[PDB]
Amino acid sequence: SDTAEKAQAIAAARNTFARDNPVSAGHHERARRSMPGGNTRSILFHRPFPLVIAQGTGSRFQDVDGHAYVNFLGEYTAGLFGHSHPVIRAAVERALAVGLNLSTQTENEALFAEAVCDRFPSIDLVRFTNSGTEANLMALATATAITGRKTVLAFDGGYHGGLLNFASGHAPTNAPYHVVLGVYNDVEGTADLLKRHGHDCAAILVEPMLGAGGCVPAERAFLDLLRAEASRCGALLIFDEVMTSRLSGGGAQEMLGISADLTTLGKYIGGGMSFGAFGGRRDLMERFDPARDGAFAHAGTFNNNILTMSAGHAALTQIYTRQAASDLSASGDRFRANLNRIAVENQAPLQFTGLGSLGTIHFSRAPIRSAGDVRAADQQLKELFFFHMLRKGIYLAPRGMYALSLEIADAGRDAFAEALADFIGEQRALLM
Amino acid sequence: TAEKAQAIAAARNTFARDNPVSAGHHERARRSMPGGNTRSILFHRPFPLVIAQGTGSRFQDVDGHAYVNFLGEYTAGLFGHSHPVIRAAVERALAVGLNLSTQTENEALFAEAVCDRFPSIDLVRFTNSGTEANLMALATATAITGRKTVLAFDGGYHGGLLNFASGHAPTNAPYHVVLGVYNDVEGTADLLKRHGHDCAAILVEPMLGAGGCVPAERAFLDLLRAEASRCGALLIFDEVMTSRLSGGGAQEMLGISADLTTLGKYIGGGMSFGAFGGRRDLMERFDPARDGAFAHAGTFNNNILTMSAGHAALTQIYTRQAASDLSASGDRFRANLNRIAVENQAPLQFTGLGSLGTIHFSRAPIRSAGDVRAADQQLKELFFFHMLRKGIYLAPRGMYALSLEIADAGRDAFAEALADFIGEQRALL
Numbered sequence A: 001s002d003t004a005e006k007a008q009a010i011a012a013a014r015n016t017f018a019r020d021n022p023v024s025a026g027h028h029e030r031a032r033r034s035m036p037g038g039n040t041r042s043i044l045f046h047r048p049f050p051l052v053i054a055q056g057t058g059s060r061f062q063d064v065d066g067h068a069y070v071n072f073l074g075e076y077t078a079g080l081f082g083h084s085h086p087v088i089r090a091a092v093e094r095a096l097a098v099g100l101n102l103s104t105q106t107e108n109e110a111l112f113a114e115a116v117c118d119r120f121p122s123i124d125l126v127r128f129t130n131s132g133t134e135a136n137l138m139a140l141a142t143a144t145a146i147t148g149r150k151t152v153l154a155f156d157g158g159y160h161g162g163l164l165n166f167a168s169g170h171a172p173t174n175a176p177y178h179v180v181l182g183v184y185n186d187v188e189g190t191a192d193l194l195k196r197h198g199h200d201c202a203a204i205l206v207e208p209m210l211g212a213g214g215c216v217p218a219e220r221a222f223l224d225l226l227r228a229e230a231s232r233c234g235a236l237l238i239f240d241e242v243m244t245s246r247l248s249g250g251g252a253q254e255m256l257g258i259s260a261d262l263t264t265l266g267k268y269i270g271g272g273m274s275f276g277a278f279g280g281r282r283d284l285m286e287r288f289d290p291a292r293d294g295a296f297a298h299a300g301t302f303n304n305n306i307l308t309m310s311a312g313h314a315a316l317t318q319i320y321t322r323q324a325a326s327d328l329s330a331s332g333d334r335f336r337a338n339l340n341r342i343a344v345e346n347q348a349p350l351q352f353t354g355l356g357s358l359g360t361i362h363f364s365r366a367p368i369r370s371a372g373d374v375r376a377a378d379q380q381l382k383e384l385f386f387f388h389m390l391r392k393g394i395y396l397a398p399r400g401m402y403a404l405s406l407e408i409a410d411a412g413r414d415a416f417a418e419a420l421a422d423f424i425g426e427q428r429a430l431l432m
Numbered sequence B: 001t002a003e004k005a006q007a008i009a010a011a012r013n014t015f016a017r018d019n020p021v022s023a024g025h026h027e028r029a030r031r032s033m034p035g036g037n038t039r040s041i042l043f044h045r046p047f048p049l050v051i052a053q054g055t056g057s058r059f060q061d062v063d064g065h066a067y068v069n070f071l072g073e074y075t076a077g078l079f080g081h082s083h084p085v086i087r088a089a090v091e092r093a094l095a096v097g098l099n100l101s102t103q104t105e106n107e108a109l110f111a112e113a114v115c116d117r118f119p120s121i122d123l124v125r126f127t128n129s130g131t132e133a134n135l136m137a138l139a140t141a142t143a144i145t146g147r148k149t150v151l152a153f154d155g156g157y158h159g160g161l162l163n164f165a166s167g168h169a170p171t172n173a174p175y176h177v178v179l180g181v182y183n184d185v186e187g188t189a190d191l192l193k194r195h196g197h198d199c200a201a202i203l204v205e206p207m208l209g210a211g212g213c214v215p216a217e218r219a220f221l222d223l224l225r226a227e228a229s230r231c232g233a234l235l236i237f238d239e240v241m242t243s244r245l246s247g248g249g250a251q252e253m254l255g256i257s258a259d260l261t262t263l264g265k266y267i268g269g270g271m272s273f274g275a276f277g278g279r280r281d282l283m284e285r286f287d288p289a290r291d292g293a294f295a296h297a298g299t300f301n302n303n304i305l306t307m308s309a310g311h312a313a314l315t316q317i318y319t320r321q322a323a324s325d326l327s328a329s330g331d332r333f334r335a336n337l338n339r340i341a342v343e344n345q346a347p348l349q350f351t352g353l354g355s356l357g358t359i360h361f362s363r364a365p366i367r368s369a370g371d372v373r374a375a376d377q378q379l380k381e382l383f384f385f386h387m388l389r390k391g392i393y394l395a396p397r398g399m400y401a402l403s404l405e406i407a408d409a410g411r412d413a414f415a416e417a418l419a420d421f422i423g424e425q426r427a428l429l
């Protein structure tokens, strides 16, 4: 729990950050005049104020006060390609040559859809959206319409987009689906909820690893329970792979040998352009065939926009192939293991959790299995870790998450590991 | 009618023989997407056209045929297919850097332009679509008021999770929505007496867009403004289409202020875009530094392509004066189309405002979803096919949305093809 001594250390770190970044401070005051709190994406705000970036290339960026950083945040997994990938750039140039806002289908949509279907083993048919939020809403829409049922089982700490935020329990802004929340990884508790609610369950919605909720892998016995009970009760199992799809050529489902009924996608698949998708079993997705009587409707001005169709096909087929996915996850597993070794050898009360190229620091010794474990870990030390990494020229999420891009190399990874050893040394007093 | 059914059979068959390369694309696209489709409004029988490329106001399909594009991406495509200023904005965004994972100055600059333009928007937040913008406005209203009921209108279209174009759709997000009749003062007053106490929001377009370019009458919008203030509901004007009609949208033209306003389409320069904005006191509930702040993340909300191209769109291309000029040009165009119908005693009209218009095969008043549905639907489909044969592309449902790239030759060609339709189909009219 919170102490005066940690608060004082945070106050000094905030004061140093403020004195070092006066141009960012002034941008925040101006931004407040047009956006609430100077903000249009809540996760970008942190106190005293966020850094404003001027420019970036490759894995690196520079803030408006002239400091340089390596970007380990990687746009919360969407920024797989760095800030200036030449193949992405060529795809943008091609989109512009085809033409913008053509108001009709192009072949580019079909080619992107075929790449997504080749790549993901339980997606027979796919439709594109403009966000992961839209992909998850459309999957819930599919489930409730098909089953005629209202109840949705999801999990505390689960994050499925702007209208489906359960990171801190029920949010008053959520779309008013009838959502029952379970505890992540809790076999017996979840089995009890499915016995009470199963018969009116339209859908079970779950990430195979909590992303925003702390990079907490799902355990097999938990995912097996969900898969078996969804089938038994006649609910659609929806795996939200908006973050986890990168973890192998075919995402977590290939790693697991477990198939969901629908799968949602987002982040890097559109080449860093706006993007989401929902897809799954043929018989479910065919309900969207507009030639069919009583077809479900799914419009959306930018669903098939040329920039996303072109960059996305390039991302999946020319850059982040299935082999590149295996190699990046192996690189990430080695990185994460090295960071935990540094913690263990120094007897530090911290660990990094995650899979492949995704991980999050948690200031705890306990196994990290559910949202409760994440919230019980020390939140002050997590904020102090954020400001420390900044001083060392390493940018990662305020909540302690990194997501390795393809542009991170040896020098970047070595600097992160060094910075961590330094944090442990310099903050030993607060780590008892 | 049997005679009209045969004319449609013949036109569908002729379209099919004209476009065998698009036919083969459709067979292949069915393999990976449901019905070969990722945006339902693009499908039409016997199959949709596939386009290969376009420049300015013109495109070419995969069979080689050229068209003037009068659809203009359902109002988003205001800049044509290759605007040099949009292109420069994309090049500047690439120079700044993609996926920078942080704020840049560009987002504040875009937001300043949006708040400057729209007279009831004190503060704004960006989304990735109009659908997201409307869902967040509903989230704001229900979360602030603590109430569940939303009044919307039959014919109304607010996005993929809020589609009332044919009444309640089974796929809509399960807000407790009550549907009135558009422009119906009596019936709508009644619904507000019954539901006012539990009403979080009144959600309404100042002109039905997808529902058929049907302008809202002043008495109807006055009713909604007065009742919303009386019962404590948030009035939400969905200006995703109508924002273009003046520099400050429909609200500037009307002198009526909604509590929240949703935006989309052309404002992000053609890039993915939506926004919700309004009264300062409502929007501050999203200040992330405030006590019990509402959360609104979204990976692409502040994306550099949208922020740069949208800033350019509002400040360099579609200025307040450009907006007045296009809407005037659009009013004169639509008047000419109606004069042609009138002079040829044709049983059709075009409804709309400024640069937006839709054909309806009826001479009755078009004031609600009922009136649009009652007009001849078979003649509407024949008209689409006929315009294609003349090298004019507009929506299957008979809507146009003039871009800045439409010029004298295109408008003249549209008008002559309308006159040709009336003469060639005289027997069915």
Ligand SMILES: Cc1ncc(COP(=O)(O)O)c(CN[C@@H](CC(=O)O)CC(C)C)c1O
Binding pocket: A041, A043, A075, A076, A130, A131, A132, A133, A134, A136, A159, A160, A161, A162, A207, A211, A212, A240, A241, A242, A243, A266, A267, A275, A276, B297, B298, B299, B300
């Ligand atoms: C598992 C999962 N499922 C859905 C979403 C929503 O995707 P969009 O942000 O594209 O709407 C997300 C989005 N995650 C991030 C969105 C942002 O960076 O603004 C935010 C979270 C770290 C809270 C996700 O992680």
Ligand SMILES: Cc1ncc(COP(=O)(O)O)c(CN[C@@H](CC(=O)O)CC(C)C)c1O
Binding pocket: A299, A300, A301, A302, B039, B041, B073, B074, B128, B129, B130, B131, B132, B134, B157, B158, B159, B160, B205, B209, B210, B238, B239, B240, B241, B264, B265, B273, B274
């Ligand atoms: C008044 C209004 N309000 C909200 C929306 C939703 O915008 P997004 O399609 O960008 O989500 C729309 C979008 N309508 C368009 C969607 C598309 O082109 O696929 C076209 C409609 C005729 C169905 C709108 O017209």
